[PDB]
Design a protein around this ligand. Sequence first.
Ligand SMILES: Cc1ccsc1CNC(=O)c1ccccc1
Ligand SMILES: [Cl-]
Ligand code: NA
Ligand code: NA
Lengths: 300, 306
Amino acid sequence: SGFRKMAFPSGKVEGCMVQVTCGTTTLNGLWLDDVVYCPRHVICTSEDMLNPNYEDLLIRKSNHNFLVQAGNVQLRVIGHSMQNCVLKLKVDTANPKTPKYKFVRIQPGQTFSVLACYNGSPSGVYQCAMRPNFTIKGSFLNGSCGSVGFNIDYDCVSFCYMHHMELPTGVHAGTDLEGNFYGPFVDRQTAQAAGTDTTITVNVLAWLYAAVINGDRWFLNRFTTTLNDFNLVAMKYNYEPLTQDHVDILGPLSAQTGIAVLDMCASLKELLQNGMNGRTILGSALLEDEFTPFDVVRQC
Amino acid sequence: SGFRKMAFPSGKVEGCMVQVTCGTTTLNGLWLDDVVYCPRHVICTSEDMLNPNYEDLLIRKSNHNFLVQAGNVQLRVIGHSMQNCVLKLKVDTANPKTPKYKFVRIQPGQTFSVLACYNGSPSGVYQCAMRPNFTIKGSFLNGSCGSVGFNIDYDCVSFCYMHHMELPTGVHAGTDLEGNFYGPFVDRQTAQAAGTDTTITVNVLAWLYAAVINGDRWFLNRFTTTLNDFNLVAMKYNYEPLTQDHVDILGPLSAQTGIAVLDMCASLKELLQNGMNGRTILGSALLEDEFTPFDVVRQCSGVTFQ
Ligand SMILES: Cc1ccsc1CNC(=O)c1ccccc1
Ligand SMILES: [Cl-]
Ligand code: NA
Ligand code: NA
């Protein structure tokens, strides 16, 4: 029993984490086989930050302009190339600690673990979700760029996020490991702003199912709802629309608890209307939206 | 920017987790140098659990009754003995992945990372506080016994917790690595209950400082208080007493943010007496007490563990 925001064990990623220096800029890189992946903005200078021409900046660089340090070891850069917003540094050693891995681009609402890193060394691990506005609500200081987000299915690491930058509201933006940004963002210091964020409805429902599985029913009610009436109410509270896909996805949890998905939706409508009235659900006084249906089944 | 519940990187401990089987029971062990540590209740049947005599249960066992798997490699057990409530299985091979480590016993209020494991395989990592009532609010399913808790300071892993059981209210109980239970619990199937818990005051204050560092300032006010005065309020609200040692430990954050501990105590006093008035702090509608002052400083400064 119990229900906690759990991250994946970080060790398979820790063994991949290196330091990449270009000029006066140092940040983290991800070393898999003989390639080190890092944000291309490591080659930016102070005057380049608003409208850098990365192709022009990159063509001016030689392999020895990139220092890559793995623990106490310098790796030799023998090649370089850019893919979208990530730089790929060929090195002369395959990482002996390379796990089984893949690169996966995720959809808003998906969760993943973040290994926060500074100077190529891991600081801490925590759990995040891709917000509907394609930002994440991270914990990142200066020097954290190149830190990555991942899940681990069986023994295979699915890398899904690389950290690039912090927006003015203090949330974070970044790319998949093919260097494509999540959301409309660009690796330039020109004014950018996250869109208004919304609550991940399918995840809240998942987490309500988790509370039932761990023995709490106080918030249920005798009502149901049509899917359309639920969405009409929920969007007035800035919740994301719930789709038939999401309903389908909640099937297993509905069967395990015996509570129909649209019955749970009616419980959620009431909670939005009433609040908690001094009660809590799984230790929280707010509705939690950073647990997916998949997370709930794996943890419970 | 940002503030998250954050565990230590778990790789150094993942390399120490093994599978331990005795009879029909499988659970986790911790393999350090040439010893595998695990809960002594691994040797009990369900009937034994009602009133175990562990030394007597142990003498029937031979080394070859303890099946130990490290990955998909069997470890050879060449000796067994108990220390308090942990069983120590001496093996013929030192763990080549043994990190620099110590066994430490933590005090209530202190935090640590739990590496939840099943069948010797790490499955998740999360942050816990040792509660004032000596339980932890963990997330454990059947098979998780022998999972461990730890801190890292420099490159030394300080092991502080081994998971043993779940109490009827769904909270969890275990020992330090020398087999001594946290709290008034015993490893037997009998009536046991968590005592009434309290809130870790020094930790809530630390979290308020974290909020301020992150620009969350609405709860600050012009007032200050005294320790005796604030501690009467704390008692009234089932909060642990605040000592001068706590005040001194918060010193750094008081100088960094310009808010004295008794100044922030006056913020907390008002929060307890009036609530939050529909607002939140660092995304929470509850006062969070599972971050220590060290946790806040370390996360708001980027300390690392290569
Ligand atoms: C997010 C982003 C986009 C283009 S650059 C960048 C982050 N990098 C810097 O802001 C910087 C670079 C060089 C010297 C000082 C600061
Ligand atoms: Cl996805
Ligand atoms: Na490293
Ligand atoms: Na004040």
